[PDB]
Design a protein around this ligand. Structure first.
Ligand code: NA
Length: 109
């Protein structure tokens, strides 16, 4: 079968996502959203690293990796059954013409 990530209710979920940063160590940012990656964006935004982002410090969505170095892996804390589904991790470096799209499948039981 196909690639899966799992967590039990209450646990943290760890969904991997990487890209190659082309310096000067500036935020070439991520769109993390609920749903398979659509054509242009990243679905229902869960964490978007720009100026439109709101209430980061209170949400359950974390970039606890070395993201300036390209580790934009998501950690969702204290997961529920509702958190099951597909996540889109999209890297728009503008920058480069071809976006980096990743669908990550999370299963919660
Ligand atoms: Na957060």
């Amino acid at each position: 079968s196909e690639v899966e990530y799992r967590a039990e209710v209450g646990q943290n979920a760890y969904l991997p996502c990487f890209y190659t940063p082309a310096a000067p160590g500036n935020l070439v940012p991520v769109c993390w959203g609920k749903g398979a990656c659509p054509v242009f964006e990243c679905g229902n935004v869960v964490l978007r690293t720009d100026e439109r982002d709101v209430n980061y410090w209170t949400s359950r969505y974390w970039l606890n990796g070395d993201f300036r170095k390209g580790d934009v892996s998501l950690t969702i804390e204290n997961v529920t059954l509702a958190d099951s589904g597909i996540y889109c991790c999209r890297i728009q470096i503008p920058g480069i013409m071809n976006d980096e799209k990743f669908n990550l499948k999370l299963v919660i039981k």
